[PDB]
Amino acid sequence: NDRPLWFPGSQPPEWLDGSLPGDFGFDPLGLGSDPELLKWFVQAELVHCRWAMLGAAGIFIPEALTKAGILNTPSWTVAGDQQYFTDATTLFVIEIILFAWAEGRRWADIINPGCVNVDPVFPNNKLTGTDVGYPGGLWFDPLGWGQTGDAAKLKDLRTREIKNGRLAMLAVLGAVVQANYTHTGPIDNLLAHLADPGHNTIFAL
Amino acid sequence: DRPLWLPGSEAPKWLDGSLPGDYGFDPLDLAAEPGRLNWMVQAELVHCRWAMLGAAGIFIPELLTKIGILNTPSWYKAGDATYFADQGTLFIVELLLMAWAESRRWADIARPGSVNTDPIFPNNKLTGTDVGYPGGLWFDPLGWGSGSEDKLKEIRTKEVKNGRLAMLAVLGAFVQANVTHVGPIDNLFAHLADPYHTTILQSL
Amino acid sequence: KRSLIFASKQSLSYLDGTLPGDYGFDPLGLMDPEGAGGFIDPQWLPYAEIINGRFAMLGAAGAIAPEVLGRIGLIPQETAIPWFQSGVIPPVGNYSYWADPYTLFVLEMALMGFAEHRRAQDYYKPGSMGKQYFLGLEKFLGGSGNPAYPGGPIFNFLGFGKNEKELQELKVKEVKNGRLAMMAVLGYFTQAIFTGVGPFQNLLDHLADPVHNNVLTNLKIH
Amino acid sequence: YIGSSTNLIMVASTTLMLFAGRFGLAPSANRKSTAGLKLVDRDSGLQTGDPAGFTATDTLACGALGHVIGVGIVLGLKATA
Amino acid sequence: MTGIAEWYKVYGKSVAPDQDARAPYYGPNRPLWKGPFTKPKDVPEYLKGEYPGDYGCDIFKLARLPANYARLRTQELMNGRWAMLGITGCLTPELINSNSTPGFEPVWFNTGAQIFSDAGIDYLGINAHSLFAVIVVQALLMGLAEYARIKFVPEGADPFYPGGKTFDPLGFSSDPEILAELKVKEIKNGRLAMMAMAGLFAQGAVTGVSPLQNLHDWLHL
Ligand code: CLA
Ligand code: CLA
Ligand SMILES: CC1=C[C@H](O)CC(C)(C)[C@H]1/C=C/C(C)=C/C=C/C(C)=C/C=C/C=C(C)/C=C/C=C(C)/C=C/C1=C(C)C[C@H](O)CC1(C)C
């Protein structure tokens, strides 16, 4: 199944075959050789990619809208050390308790697909999803889209999601490291780079 | 088959489908050895029933004391109040009376259907066929635990669940008054006042 | 077929495994049947080992029991004393019992003589303690073929070892615990000299600061 | 005391003697010395778990001689320097 | 049959032919990762014991694919050998001299910034601050050794146990049985080196002091 590759002139790894969404035969280290580990890795990829989408949004959009617009969030790096409705070391435990349920349901789905597709309270609110990592139902795909019967448009949308998500992952890693080193926010750094593309770089520290 | 403690899992072989409250919750396999299962089900029956009674003496008193209808002392301070008898004497009298009742139950567990007759008067008999559920006119004055097997599981399941919750609640009170040094009901009405700064973590 | 500690070609010739604790450890060849004599012979050494071990089991669990029970606080503290301060060695310490320790020693000698001489006469002449009248209970003290294991209605009144396999395993367990208790009593003695405090005190000192409380740091005596 | 010169000397002497006895550089229970100081093999009859043939008696002998030599060296170095 | 190959006073398990130097560590009756508590539920059906260091520990089921199992074994061997050299190279500097008074450094994790600033690397007490003059030489030398190892297998030698005259000059592996146990010895010492290294990394990350000084503080105090 010849397809575009990360490295045009390379033989695709045998275990990869292009069926998975966003599969470009990029396994230089041969980590996803074992099929079961490959399945686990694709689930991990999906979850990291979505969490990175959310993190990039919440890191940049507020900071895109502070130098302009209205929302004056001072920074995302010092956003943690603030005051809120509840303290930090117990907000953490509240988050852990609230997330244990959902994370356990997803874990059970990964180990045993289909066992966690029913609402525990009312045994009628199913989820209508047979592809792992994409439950669907009415909390995850409320606005119809998400299924296409038997076609490949869904595969294209899957690839779009994977690719946007890898971009978001890289962007948030850049946000973290570039905040750690430049001692400054991301958006003003972008503006400064645009001002002087040449001298303002990773070398003028 | 039945809803287990984990939605996706396989119940242990020994906990097939029978005992009331059976949810296949045995991660540590503490009843795997044959014969031990009967001992444990009786053991949990005893703790839960005791815990039900122990929770009604730790919360209901304080429940209708804080609002105020009885003015009883706290659960964790009732062990020093002077009563008509002595604390030590009350302990020993309990021990002997507990010894008789516990010993009668023990003989039933070891040899089922052997302690079913009244010693003083060999005419009164105790209505009971399942170990751990002995009826008669004393334990079962209303006949609410005999008949079709279907309702037996329901009521027995209702019994154990309230008991399991009761055992958990009393454990709280023990530890939960130990560190906070305050009554249980006081903690409830202090948790609904400012919930987000009254937590286990903020008690060290 | 079994664990060997420091066996030799000579030792393994006569140590085959019949005895409970038989692991071939005989570097000095003290149980060689070729030169069997009065007390150095195959018939006496296992018996002497068992008896020394049983008295050592009583000693190791008795030289430390009062101290432990007083530390947990259920015996009087004045009776919670190290073993060497209980009048066994009056110079290091003495205790006032109902009788002075020499009268107690004479009573002990009389009672232990009545017991020990009978044990000896059953060892040398088996079954001889079940014939002559002895307050009517000479029939309980008849013993069996093996001197170390009488197993009568008195010496075995819970009736362990109904089968031979469990009986032999229990023998091996007895021999091991006895050897451990003997080594423990030797440790009690040496630690009493080198430390001046009871065995439980030494254990707690080691458990507190193991690297500064050991033989290397504590051969300064005091 | 672990880093002291006495400790180092004693450890080195004992280790060297044990190494010599174990690796056939000194007489042992299974390594007899002839009149020409050549080491021949003998059956001492003591079974040991050491593949080479180092016995418990060999260990005790080597340790004792190593301690003797180490004490000699320590006291000599103290008296001289 | 060759240089210090008949030197049979290092076996480790055999006073005599009673054992063949490979009976343990291989086959069904071998030591496992939980001693006698290895009732078969975690010992898989592919770890039979043909390879050195097989203790039957595949909790996470990584080596369930035989091809991946071979790759993992080679990868274990290489970090294992490199870990052995590294721990030796991290300790020997601080068993010979000590104190960072000159541009020398007895601390393994502070010797890398030694050149970067101030002085250059002064072996035991080769200069200046030029990074990209050691870097290129090391990159060039390793790239070709790295490249000559993945290739250039003479005709049929194991690419990880060549055993010719340049990698086994002393001929310890002439006897197959002594090669079987030496492989177990190699992997086990290698695993120890790796755990020691993780200890150095973690201890340095937490305590921040030289590993031996950590030992001195722990033991003496
Ligand atoms: C989507 C990725 C992304 C983008 C667009 C940027 C953009 C920028 N970064 Mg950030 N950065 C990133 C990822 C990214 N970074 C990551 C992953 C790291 C961690 C290594 C960093 C660490 C970092 C530091 C420490 C610094 C910057 C700086 C900069 C600015 C100057 C460019 C530069 O020095 O590049 C440096 C880039 C790298 C070292 C890594 C390459 C980036 C990725 C991996 C490759 C590009 C991917 C993709 C093809 C780009 C598509 C862009 C498209 C939307 C047009 C610029 C605003 C500098 C700054 O603030 O200047 C004002 C600065 O000091 N970045
Ligand atoms: C039953 C065997 C036994 C046990 C458990 C102990 C335990 C202990 N001894 Mg005692 N000891 C024993 C036999 C034993 N000893 C014998 C036979 C002698 C005479 C040579 C001594 C002479 C002795 C002295 C002089 C001192 C101790 C000390 C100690 C403490 C450890 C620190 C130390 O330097 O040890 C040194 C240990 C030895 C010199 C004896 C080592 C060899 C014997 C055979 C013990 C072997 C232990 C073995 C693992 C079996 C343990 C059984 C069980 C616990 C698993 C510790 C409480 C020290 C102490 O009190 O610290 C405050 C101390 O100063 N012991
Ligand atoms: C087995 C198993 C099984 C199951 O299945 C699961 C589990 C359990 C999880 C698993 C586990 C695992 C593990 C543990 C691993 C580990 C690893 C390591 C440690 C490595 C190291 C590794 C290590 C290594 C390589 C090392 C290396 C080293 C080096 C290079 C060094 C270098 C150096 C030095 C000398 C010093 C100087 O001055 C400088 C430098 C430059 C710094």
Automatic annotation (TrEMBL), chain A:
Chlorophyll b 4 binds at R50, R105. It is a multi-pass membrane protein. Chlorophyll b 5 binds at R50. It is found in: Plastid, Chloroplast thylakoid membrane. GO terms for biological process: photosynthesis, light harvesting in photosystem I; response to light stimulus. Chlorophyll b 6 binds at W101, R105, D119, N125, W139. Chlorophyll a 5 binds at H193. Chlorophyll b 1 binds at W6, R50, K163. GO terms for molecular function: chlorophyll binding; metal ion binding. Chlorophyll b 2 binds at F24, F26, G32, E45, R166. Coiled coil: none annotated. One of its GO terms (cellular component) is chloroplast thylakoid membrane. Keywords: Chlorophyll, Chloroplast, Chromophore, Magnesium, Membrane, Metal-binding, Photosynthesis, Photosystem I, Photosystem II, Plastid, Thylakoid, Transit peptide, Transmembrane, Transmembrane helix. Chlorophyll a 3 binds at R50, G136, E161. Chlorophyll a 4 binds at N164. All-trans-violaxanthin binds at D27, L29, W76. The keyword Magnesium applies. Chlorophyll a 2 binds at H48, E103, R106. Chlorophyll b 3 binds at F24, F26, E45, R166. Chlorophyll a 1 binds at W40, H48, Q82, E161, N164, R166, Q178, H193. Belongs to the light-harvesting chlorophyll a/b-binding (LHC) protein family. The light-harvesting complex (LHC) functions as a light receptor, it captures and delivers excitation energy to photosystems with which it is closely associated. This is Chlorophyll a-b binding protein, chloroplastic. It comes from Physcomitrium patens (Spreading-leaved earth moss). The chain holds residues 63 to 267 of 273 of the full protein.
UniProtKB/TrEMBL annotation, chain C:
GO terms for biological process: photosynthesis, light harvesting in photosystem I; response to light stimulus. Its main location: plastid. Chlorophyll a 5 binds at N52. Chlorophyll b 1 binds at R54, R118, L141. Chlorophyll a 4 binds at W44, N52. Chlorophyll a 1 binds at Y23, G24, F25, E49, K173, E174, N177, R179, Q191, H206. Chlorophyll a 11 binds at Q191, V215. Chlorophyll a 8 binds at V88. Chlorophyll a 9 binds at H117. Chlorophyll a 12 binds at H206, N214. Chlorophyll a 7 binds at R54, G151, E174. Keywords: Chlorophyll, Chloroplast, Chromophore, Magnesium, Membrane, Metal-binding, Phosphoprotein, Photosynthesis, Photosystem I, Photosystem II, Plastid, Thylakoid, Transit peptide, Transmembrane, Transmembrane helix. Chlorophyll a 3 binds at E49, E116, R119. The keyword Coiled coil does not apply. Belongs to the light-harvesting chlorophyll a/b-binding (LHC) protein family. This is Chlorophyll a-b binding protein, chloroplastic.
Automatic annotation (TrEMBL), chain D:
It is found in: Membrane; Plastid, Chloroplast. Chlorophyll a 6 binds at D50, A56. It comes from the Eukaryota. GO terms for biological process: photosynthesis. Chlorophyll a 7 binds at H67. Chlorophyll a 5 binds at D50, F54. Chlorophyll a 3 binds at R22, D50. Its main location: membrane. Keywords: Chloroplast, Membrane, Photosynthesis, Photosystem I, Plastid, Transmembrane. It is a multi-pass membrane protein. Chlorophyll a 2 binds at M17. Chlorophyll a 1 binds at N7, H67. GO terms for cellular component: chloroplast; photosystem I. Chlorophyll a 4 binds at L25. Belongs to the PsaG/PsaK family. This is PSI-K. The gene is LOC112280125.
Automatic annotation (TrEMBL), chain E:
One of its GO terms (molecular function) is chlorophyll binding. Chlorophyll b 2 binds at A113, Q138. GO terms for cellular component: chloroplast thylakoid membrane; photosystem I; photosystem II. Chlorophyll a 6 binds at E146, R149. Chlorophyll a 4 binds at R71, N79, S130. It comes from Physcomitrium patens (Spreading-leaved earth moss). Chlorophyll a 1 binds at S14, E76, Q114, L124, K185, E186, K188, N189, R191, Q203. One of its GO terms (biological process) is response to light stimulus. Chlorophyll b 3 binds at I126, H129, S130. Chlorophyll a 3 binds at Y55, C57, Y69, E76, R191. Its main location: plastid. Chlorophyll a 8 binds at G163, E186. Chlorophyll a 7 binds at G163, E186. Chlorophyll a 2 binds at Y55, G56, C57, E76. Chlorophyll b 1 binds at W33, R81, Q138, E146. The chain holds residues 87 to 311 of 311 of the full protein. The light-harvesting complex (LHC) functions as a light receptor, it captures and delivers excitation energy to photosystems with which it is closely associated. It is found in: Plastid, Chloroplast thylakoid membrane. The keyword Nucleus does not apply. Chlorophyll a 5 binds at Q75, N79. This is Chlorophyll a-b binding protein, chloroplastic. Keywords: Chlorophyll, Chloroplast, Chromophore, Photosynthesis, Photosystem I, Photosystem II, Plastid, Thylakoid. Belongs to the light-harvesting chlorophyll a/b-binding (LHC) protein family. Chlorophyll a 10 binds at N189. Chlorophyll a 9 binds at K185, N189. Signal peptide: none annotated. Chlorophyll a 11 binds at Q203, T207.
